[PDB]
Ligand binder design. Sequence first.
Ligand code: HEM
Ligand SMILES: NCc1ccc(-c2csnn2)cc1
Ligand SMILES: [Cl-]
Ligand SMILES: [Cl-]
Ligand SMILES: [Cl-]
Length: 411
Amino acid sequence: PSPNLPPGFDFTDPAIYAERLPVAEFAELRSAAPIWWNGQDPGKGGGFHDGGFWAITKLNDVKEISRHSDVFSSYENGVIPRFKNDIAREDIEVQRFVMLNMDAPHHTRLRKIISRGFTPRAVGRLHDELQERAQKIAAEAAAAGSGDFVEQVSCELPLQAIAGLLGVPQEDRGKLFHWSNEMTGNEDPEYAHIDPKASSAELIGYAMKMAEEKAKNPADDIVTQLIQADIDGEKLSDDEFGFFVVMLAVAGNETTRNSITQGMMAFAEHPDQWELYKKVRPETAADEIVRWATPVTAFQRTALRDYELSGVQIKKGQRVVMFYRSANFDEEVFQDPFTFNILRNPNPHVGFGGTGAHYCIGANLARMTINLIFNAVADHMPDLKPISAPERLRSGWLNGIKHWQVDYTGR
Ligand code: HEM
Ligand SMILES: NCc1ccc(-c2csnn2)cc1
Ligand SMILES: [Cl-]
Ligand SMILES: [Cl-]
Ligand SMILES: [Cl-]
């Protein structure tokens, strides 16, 4: 029995996400076709011209794909499953220069370097400054009375986390934030004029100058650990540091922003969870917010060989698309997946991906950012109330909120 979906439905269609999350449609796949061939008409594959892909909807299959990175490649077609239909193949392949789109052994070496400086100690060293910034953000928003929660609450702390991790001078954070924002959303009419390639090139140029500067003056950041040779002489070259900065700018900005916006949307819809949060301030809330928000709807892989997955024969060369938005509501893993429960524990969501080689290196920085901003929201605008419905982002793989009008003082 085929799944009850409209003919030609494409779960990476940006026109869907501009209006809604296809929650009923994912639930139908989980019940009737948990691994399902998503066909794509000629020229309508978002930059891929292979006839379609396997939709992966169950959490255990997402973990299996993610852990078998020897078979399911990030490099072969990159991990973003949807671009503009007319994107040039060369513009997909240039994305192989960021760690996200690399396979072992190249990925292994680069991740080892990135992780010697990107440690729990390094992240914890940002706690106090990000806490001060979160309190300032929430106080200034509340002072405004009403406004766009996305812009006045959600946007700034994730960017300041990237700046503090890298030790970016305060005078440069404006342009750093500009470049980061220019590298996502280009399929939405509101952002039709951004140029992510041009922005990435400007950020690489900036980052390579940073690498040369911070080599002369080591400072209390991660850059020095990254650009300094270890025992084996392993280190990021200046251009590798540049591609890492591009990586961070695109990985840790709008993802965390959208988790914050949709976290507060969830609190607005579940007042009892908001009351509980304000009283207990449970840090388990961050993981339930990421599960609920699933800011990356999906990443893909490409089979390097034939592989049988939960009884379905994946063929060499075929793409599999891991729908984290479906897996995070998998009835076989979660008790009451469609209950927003900030005390959920353990919370084995895959909002940060399936376990394995590419697991989000910023997961704990993201959780800390979320916990700090929601404490600040609780401290300064405990009675906020939405004014109008969120405006969603036209994207085929990112779950974004562009704007959300709220009354911070609660009438
Ligand atoms: C709630 C916010 C975030 C979400 C939902 C998220 C999600 C993800 C996902 C789904 C992946 C791919 C994992 C996989 O394929 O197995 C990933 C990888 C990555 N994330 Fe995050 N992320 C978030 C925040 C951040 C932040 C704040 C940073 C750094 C400041 C960051 C840096 C990275 C990097 C560098 C990678 C690539 C790791 C690799 O390929 O080895 N992310 N993230
Ligand atoms: N942290 C998850 C994440 C990683 C890379 C991207 C991204 C956006 S454009 N190229 N890569 C977005 C989100
Ligand atoms: Cl293709
Ligand atoms: Cl088109
Ligand atoms: Cl659960």
